[PDB]
Amino acid sequence: DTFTAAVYEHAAILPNATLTPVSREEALALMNRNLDILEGAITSAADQGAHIIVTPEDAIYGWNFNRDSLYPYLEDIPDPEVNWIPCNNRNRFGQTPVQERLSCLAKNNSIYVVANIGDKKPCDTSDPQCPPDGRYQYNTDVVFDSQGKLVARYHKQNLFMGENQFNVPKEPEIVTFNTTFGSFGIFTCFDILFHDPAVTLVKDFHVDTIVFPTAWMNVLPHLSAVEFHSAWAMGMRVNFLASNIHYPSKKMTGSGIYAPNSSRAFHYDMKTEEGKLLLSQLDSHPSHSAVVNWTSYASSIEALSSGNKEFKGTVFFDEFTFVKLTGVAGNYTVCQKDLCCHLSYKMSENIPNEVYALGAFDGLHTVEGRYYLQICTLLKCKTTNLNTCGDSAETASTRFEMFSLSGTFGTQYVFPEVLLSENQLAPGEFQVSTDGRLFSLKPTSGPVLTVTLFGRLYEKD
Numbered sequence: 001d002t003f004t005a006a007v008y009e010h011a012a013i014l015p016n017a018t019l020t021p022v023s024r025e026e027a028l029a030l031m032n033r034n035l036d037i038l039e040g041a042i043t044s045a046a047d048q049g050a051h052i053i054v055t056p057e058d059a060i061y062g063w064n065f066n067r068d069s070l071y072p073y074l075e076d077i078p079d080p081e082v083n084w085i086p087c088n089n090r091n092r093f094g095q096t097p098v099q100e101r102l103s104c105l106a107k108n109n110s111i112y113v114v115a116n117i118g119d120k121k122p123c124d125t126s127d128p129q130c131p132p133d134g135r136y137q138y139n140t141d142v143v144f145d146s147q148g149k150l151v152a153r154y155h156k157q158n159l160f161m162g163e164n165q166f167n168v169p170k171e172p173e174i175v176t177f178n179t180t181f182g183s184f185g186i187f188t189c190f191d192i193l194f195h196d197p198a199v200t201l202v203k204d205f206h207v208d209t210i211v212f213p214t215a216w217m218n219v220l221p222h223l224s225a226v227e228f229h230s231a232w233a234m235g236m237r238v239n240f241l242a243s244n245i246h247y248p249s250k251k252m253t254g255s256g257i258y259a260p261n262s263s264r265a266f267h268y269d270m271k272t273e274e275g276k277l278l279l280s281q282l283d284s285h286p287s288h289s290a291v292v293n294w295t296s297y298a299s300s301i302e303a304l305s306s307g308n309k310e311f312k313g314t315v316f317f318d319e320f321t322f323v324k325l326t327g328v329a330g331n332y333t334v335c336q337k338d339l340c341c342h343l344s345y346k347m348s349e350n351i352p353n354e355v356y357a358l359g360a361f362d363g364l365h366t367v368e369g370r371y372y373l374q375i376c377t378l379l380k381c382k383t384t385n386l387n388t389c390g391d392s393a394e395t396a397s398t399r400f401e402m403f404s405l406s407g408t409f410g411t412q413y414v415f416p417e418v419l420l421s422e423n424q425l426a427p428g429e430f431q432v433s434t435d436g437r438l439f440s441l442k443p444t445s446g447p448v449l450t451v452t453l454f455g456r457l458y459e460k461d
Ligand SMILES: *[C@@H]1O[C@H](CO)[C@@H](O[C@@H]2O[C@H](CO)[C@@H](O[C@@H]3O[C@H](CO[C@@H]4O[C@H](CO)[C@@H](O)[C@H](O[C@@H]5O[C@H](CO)[C@@H](O)[C@H](O)[C@@H]5O)[C@@H]4O)[C@@H](O)[C@H](O[C@@H]4O[C@H](CO)[C@@H](O)[C@H](O)[C@@H]4O)[C@@H]3O)[C@H](O)[C@H]2NC(C)=O)[C@H](O)[C@H]1NC(C)=O
Pocket: 178, 179, 180, 183, 285, 286
């Protein structure tokens, strides 16, 4: 059993913004301008045989808001248990034109539609957690099935910097929907860096596939959307449908269809202002049983290199301990606190004016989000000056004939990333061993930007 998956990268029409909140008529007009574009992708995906389509986070109204400017865009989204086809019973829950339009899009195209809209929940001064506003406002994913029925409603648990227009639910929402093409879980953007509900869906609810609306801002070398989202899919052994906003000026680009063994389709484009529809087949019930012990090999072996010139280098505001790679081939070990990283490599050639380093990081990230990390990275330094190792490098010339990366990870949640020049994924050029080694299966098809083992220590957050 296989199915055809679809994701759409969306160049959104953002509201003029801001000063005074718009009328419900003006908010609806804007939302319908974005929905007209999404209708275009949904109908094409359905005409091309897709079983499900994911659209991005904030694709219908953007991200520039305060609590009051957002309010006119909001709908009261009922509990999916209510058993409702908004297309077949338009006024069951009052004025809900966005829900009705999404339901009709799913129903008329006989396709599952995943979209991200806004939920309004009015509350009384009686409950202590009710905002002084008189309502809760949630960043919400909605899922409509092939018949137009509301089958999932998910309120974003992990809010990003400046998402003050939204509230956090009391308890993390573990939202799943079952189909004839596998069990599905759902979360949004920043949720991918946290345990709840992301890890819970996979390890406890045993989902086959994650549907993921996102408005991701690319942060090289480790947090580029295609790179990190496919790594997370591989580390969690799940299918992953990443639908991202298309906005190059904010570094937003990177949608794909990821399988547990490799990426199946991906899109990165910083040049045009156009959206993109991606389609690809996936196994409905992929194997989830390919277990990895991430510290195994690394904890067994002794330091590959001795007495070396180690330097501190900044990677996304985090101070890594690096060791420059010297020679077209080598074996290095670098440690930072509780983490020891090992690399075995062989380059295709010793390209001039291009420096590579092996970095180690064990610590808490605090800039624009608080999360505990353990990272082992083989990265292309921006220039030849070692104080540029860890800075965003979009191009490289060095192809690798072989690599083997591993670390003494104090966690079972490690995401294996392989990124080529210029933000290209490498499918299926690498694998992960049961021992915890990220290794090449072939010489890389393009020059290497990074080979990273990105680990999360959720308990140390
Ligand atoms: C979400 O929806 C899914 C899909 O509907 C639900 O999963 C289904 O659950 C049913 C109830 O437990 C399962 O039915 C039983 O199936 C076995 C036969 O084994 C299966 O053979 C199938 C055909 O060859 C195959 O599709 C199926 O799935 C596969 O399982 C293997 C491991 O074995 C795995 O590798 C694959 O990834 C895939 O999962 C099995 O191989 C029957 O023996 C069994 O007996 C009957 O009980 C009936 C009463 O329930 C009775 O009518 C009858 O007389 C027998 O006594 C059931 O028919 C079904 O296999 C399973 N399907 C899948 C794809 O998982 C899932 O439960 C839902 N989840 C939630 C949370 O709601």
